[PDB]
Amino acid sequence: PLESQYQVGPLLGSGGFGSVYSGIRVSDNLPVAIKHVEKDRISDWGELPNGTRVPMEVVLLKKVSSGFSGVIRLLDWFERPDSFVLILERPEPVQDLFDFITERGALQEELARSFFWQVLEAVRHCHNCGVLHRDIKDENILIDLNRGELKLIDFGSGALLKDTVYTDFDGTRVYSPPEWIRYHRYHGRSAAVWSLGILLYDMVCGDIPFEHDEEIIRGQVFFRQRVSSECQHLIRWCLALRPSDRPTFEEIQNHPWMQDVLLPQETAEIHLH
Numbered sequence: 001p002l003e004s005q006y007q008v009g010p011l012l013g014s015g016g017f018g019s020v021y022s023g024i025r026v027s028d029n030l031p032v033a034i035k036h037v038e039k040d041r042i043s044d045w046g047e048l049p050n051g052t053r054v055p056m057e058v059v060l061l062k063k064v065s066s067g068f069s070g071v072i073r074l075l076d077w078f079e080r081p082d083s084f085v086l087i088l089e090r091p092e093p094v095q096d097l098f099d100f101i102t103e104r105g106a107l108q109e110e111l112a113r114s115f116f117w118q119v120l121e122a123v124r125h126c127h128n129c130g131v132l133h134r135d136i137k138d139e140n141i142l143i144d145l146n147r148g149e150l151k152l153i154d155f156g157s158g159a160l161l162k163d164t165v166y167t168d169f170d171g172t173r174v175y176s177p178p179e180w181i182r183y184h185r186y187h188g189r190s191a192a193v194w195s196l197g198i199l200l201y202d203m204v205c206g207d208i209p210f211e212h213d214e215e216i217i218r219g220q221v222f223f224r225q226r227v228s229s230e231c232q233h234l235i236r237w238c239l240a241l242r243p244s245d246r247p248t249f250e251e252i253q254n255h256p257w258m259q260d261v262l263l264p265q266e267t268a269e270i271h272l273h
């Protein structure tokens, strides 16, 4: 079933997310990525319309799979005796945002604006479709270098979006908000906005702002690179200590620092080609 349809290539990487291989769809040569997840490592299960018991990750990906290219598309999946296999699209050439920032150091504001805008559009898309990622960070964002388009990956820490409190969290700690650190409680939207502030700081400073719990709780942001005041203000706003003081997605995208964003294609021509 999986054997003849996909020709398997090298290992792209592995972690809490599982093991992901480069691959090619045999019928039409399409570039793909092939992700294996062991059943024993999955603590979070869900259910399709079908009533079939799958990993929540699969539920979340199917709910967001549509014309929109800001989220990695699930092309197919398969169950095996001890694992699930996911076939995802693979842009070529591609690089993850963590590697891209490591190579360049801090990004120019114009490039950070375009990237961040695209992450925002993509997270809004997820929220629209009832999905909360819960692990927004540079390693979970791929750059299609030709088109200048970003894609969210790794929905393995995600959840159905809801308006009531969350008391579980298995995403990345240094991107998690102070209310989680202190009370093991958070709400979806406001926690997401906090991770987005961490991500934006990361883009423009070349590194995340907080390491330890106490830095997160104190929430004092020091800028290690030259960053415009508008951007500093947006960042500080997203990282407000009280959840209710954080901006909505609308307020972020109406922020003065976010005006006049480049198109993705313009972004590739100026900064990636």
Ligand SMILES: Nc1ncc(-c2ccc3n[nH]c(-c4cnc5ccccc5c4)c3c2)s1
Pocket (backbone or CB within 6 Å): 012, 013, 017, 020, 032, 033, 035, 072, 088, 089, 090, 091, 094, 095, 096, 142, 153, 154
């Ligand atoms: N940790 C991960 N979970 C899913 C991942 C994933 C999913 C779909 C992908 N399409 N293309 C890639 C990918 C990612 N990183 C690369 C790094 C170098 C070269 C090619 C790459 C392709 C995907 C990775 S990575």
